[PDB]
């Protein structure tokens, strides 16, 4: 093979089918691992009297001659792991008095001969894990008093009888984790003194075994993945030197109030699923904890003496309990992370977190905390993260928070106070409840601050309207709409003598668009009063009734105008076809009522108008009330399509002219100015297309109230009826 100078022959992977020859007799480590050897002939190793480590790890070995391993009295380590031995080679390994380690873990061993392991007076490491045996070889193991490590992990041992390991007085480590163990007798672990590691992880344990009481020197115990539910008090009486318990993923119900008593060297305790536990465990005598974790229980209190002891405590997880009050955390100078989420916490006292240096992460999420003291963080050390999400807060302290890096207040909707960026100098990731509160931080000064609710353009930091262009456009549109609609209404209602249906529709449409003019004027005046400081007024405007009033005004005006246009087209169709003033007035009243109901629908709903200071629901909001937006868009489309097809049929079947021209102008302009509003309303929900929020807001502002400032000018300067009625008014006033 590949002979080596250090007398360590490595024949791995050579593919030979026998014991290699032509090797120095003074070799001390022979490796025949990966090749294919199926049997060891008699006196196979007669040429290696000084062999010390034999590794047959990987051959398809299936038979060993009784005299094959004879004469290797200097052998110390033997490895036969991945072969296909069907049983422990009892007769093959006889006489190897100097053997100290045996690997048989991966064989397909199904039965251990009774007289096996005879003469192995120096054995100290045994591997039998991944075999398939049903019972612990009690009698074969009774002949190995010097054993110090045993593994029967992946076997199929159903249970362990009494006095199985009686003579293993020097055992140290026992691994039975992935075994299919279902029960353990009271005296199974008998005589296993100075045992420092026990693994029973994936067994099918029903209850907690009582054999542990016979392991006075246990240090690490693993029974985490069993089907254990009950851990009665006193389960660790006979283990004063215990240091580690693994009890995760086993569904527990009751763990007892005194399970972990006077455990001096325990350094961890993570209990999950203990639903029926409602009292804090008796931790007296356990003062070396590092991380304490009691997640799922019904605990409602914490002993005030918690920090008097356990000075080494670092992590405190008490989340899924129902904790109302909080004691004083004075002490616990090494306490690092605190989780108090999903409890029911009413108020934070001033001295709860007094001192307590090195406290970095403190979670207070999902707790109905309506009161936080003003100076509950002045005496706190370097605290990196701070989350108070979903806490129903009414105010927030400022002192001592400059060192914060990440602060989260996502769920505190009632927190309407304005935060100050003068304090959170080092703040990096802020999550305010309302997007207006993060204006002072210049969302996306001294550093870069990332705000979770994006400010964007739909939440104007300084100017609701935007640039001077949009400002003056909206200003003059509102002025024209209001003044001309008022003048048209005055001229129309000065007479109150002639009431043709077409002029009735004209007057009603003017009235409807007057409300849109009024709402645009409200927006302009709000922008004028709040110049550069609109983010301050944003929360007030959204949460106040002004948003509801504006949203109503706008929606009612739009729907009233649409319904009036539809009914005017219906009347024109009836006139073309061939007395009906009463039914037309009734239809107009019904349309007014329907528009009022449509405008009031968001008032019945919750938060539809709160999408933006525009307070128009569907343009700036697409996901909330998406069904309502779709229904209103479809209704508007149906009305426009019906009026369009009626007009088309009228012009087809027909060759008062001013009324026809005004109806045509009105329908064309209304369709032209109404399509982009719906398109931009549905724009954000379309993933494929991306439109800037500034453009969306400008388009909405310049398109929604356009008919209000357009139609009265048309009616005034596109009809001699205006001149005739003005002469009539002049005669009336003179």
């Amino acid at each position, epitope marked *: 093979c590949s002979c080596d100078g250090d007398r360590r022959v490595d024949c791995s992977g050579k593919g030979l089918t026998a014991v290699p020859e032509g090797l120095s007799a003074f070799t001390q480590a022979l490796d025949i691992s990966m090749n294919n050897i199926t049997q060891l002939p008699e006196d196979a190793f007669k040429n290696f009297p000084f062999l010390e480590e034999l590794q047959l790890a990987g051959n398809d070995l*299936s038979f060993i001659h*009784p005299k094959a391993l004879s004469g290797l009295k200097e052998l110390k380590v033997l490895t036969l792991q991945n072969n296909q031995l069907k049983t422990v080679p009892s007769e093959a390994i006889r006489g190897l008095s100097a053997l100290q380690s045996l690997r048989l873990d991966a064989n397909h061993i199904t039965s251990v001969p009774e007289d096996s392991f005879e003469g192995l007076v120096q054995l100290r490491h045994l591997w039998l894990d991944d075999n398939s045996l049903t019972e612990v070889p009690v009698h074969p193991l009774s002949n190995l008093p010097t054993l110090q490590a045993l593994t029967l992990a992946l076997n199929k041992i159903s249970s362990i009888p009494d006095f199985a390991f009686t003579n293993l007085s020097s055992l140290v480590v026992l691994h039975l984790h992935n075994n299919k163990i279902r029960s353990l007798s009271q005296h199974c672990f008998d005589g296993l003194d100075n045992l420092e590691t026990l693994d029973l992880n994936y067994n099918n344990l029903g209850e907690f075994p009582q054999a542990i009481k016979a392991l006075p020197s246990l240090k690490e115990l693993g029974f985490h993945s069993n089907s254990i539910s009950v851990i009665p008090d006193g389960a660790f009486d006979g283990n004063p030197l215990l240091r580690t318990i693994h009890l995760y993923d086993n569904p527990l119900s009751f763990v007892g109030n005194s399970a972990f008593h006077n455990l001096s060297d325990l350094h961890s305790l993570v209990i999950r699923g203990a639903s029926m536990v409602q009292q804090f465990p008796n931790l007296t005598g356990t003062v070396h904890l590092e991380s304490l974790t009691l997640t799922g229980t019904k605990i409602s209190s914490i002993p005030n003496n918690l920090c008097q002891e356990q000075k080494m405590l670092r992590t405190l997880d008490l989340s899924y309990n129902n904790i109302r009050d909080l004691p004083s955390f004075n002490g616990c100078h090494a306490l690092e992370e605190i989780s108090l989420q999903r409890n029911q916490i009413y108020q934070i006292k001033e001295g709860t977190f007094q001192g307590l240096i090195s406290l970095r992460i403190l979670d207070l999420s999902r707790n109905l905390i309506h009161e936080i003291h003003s100076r509950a963080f002045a005496t706190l050390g370097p605290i990196t993260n701070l989350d108070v999400s979903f806490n129903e807060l009414t105010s927030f302290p400022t002192e001592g928070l400059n060192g914060l890096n990440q602060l989260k207040l996502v769920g505190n909707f009632k927190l309407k106070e304005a935060l100050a960026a003068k304090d959170f100098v080092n703040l990096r990731s802020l999550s305010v409840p309302y997007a207006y509160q993060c204006c002072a931080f210049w969302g996306c000064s001294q550093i870069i601050i990332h705000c979770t609710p994006s400010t964007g353009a739909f939440k104007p930091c300084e100017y609701l309207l935007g640039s001077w262009m949009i400002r003056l456009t909206v200003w003059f549109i509102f002025l024209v709409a209001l003044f001309f609609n008022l003048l048209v209404i005055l001229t129309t209602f000065a007479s109150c003598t002639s009431l043709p249906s077409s002029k009735l529709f004209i007057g009603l449409i003017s009235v409807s668009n007057l409300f849109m003019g009024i709402y645009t004027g409200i927006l302009t005046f709000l922008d004028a009063v709040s110049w550069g400081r609109f983010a301050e007024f944003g929360i007030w405007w959204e949460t106040g009734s002004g948003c509801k009033v504006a949203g109503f005004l706008a929606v009612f005006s739009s729907e009233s105008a649409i319904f009036l246009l539809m009914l005017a087209t219906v009347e024109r169709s009836l006139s073309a076809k061939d007395n009906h003033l009463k039914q037309f007035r009734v239809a107009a009243l019904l349309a007014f009522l329907g528009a009022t109901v449509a405008g009031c629908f968001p008032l019945f709903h919750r938060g539809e108008y709160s999408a933006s200071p525009l307070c128009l629901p569907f343009p700036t909001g697409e996901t909330p009330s998406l069904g309502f937006t779709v229904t209103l868009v479809l209704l508007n489309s149906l009305a426009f399509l019906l009026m369009a097809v009626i007009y088309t049929k009228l012009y087809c079947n027909l060759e008062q002219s001013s009324m026809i021209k005004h109806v045509a102008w009105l329908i064309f302009t209304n369709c032209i100015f109404f399509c982009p509003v719906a398109f931009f309303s549905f724009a954000p929900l379309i993933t494929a297309i991306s439109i800037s929020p500034e453009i969306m807001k400008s388009v909405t502002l310049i398109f929604f109230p356009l008919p209000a400032c357009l139609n009265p000018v048309l009616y005034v300067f596109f009809n001699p009826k205006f001149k005739e009625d003005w002469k009539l008014l002049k005669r009336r006033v003179t």
Partner: nanobody
Amino acid sequence: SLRLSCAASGYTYSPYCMGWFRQAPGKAREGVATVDLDGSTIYADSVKGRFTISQDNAKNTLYLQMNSLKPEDTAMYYCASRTRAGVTCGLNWAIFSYWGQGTQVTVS
């Protein structure tokens, strides 16, 4: 049909748990018949009925008679024995302390 004959030429006394094994090419050795010192016999599932065993301590000879040889019987046959006692008999190959040279048998 053949009668394999095995002789304990150098054995001193007390033949304890003799047996017969067959080996396939490049495979493990499987027991076909085990005879205890009390005359009790243990036969393989694919063997019982077809084969018979007989031990005579007067000549210390073990005879394994074979009949109705199916082509699955072609293998190298060995006889194995264990002088020192203290273990339970069976078809395991890890208990016998002495093995024969074995003859190749094929259907003929």
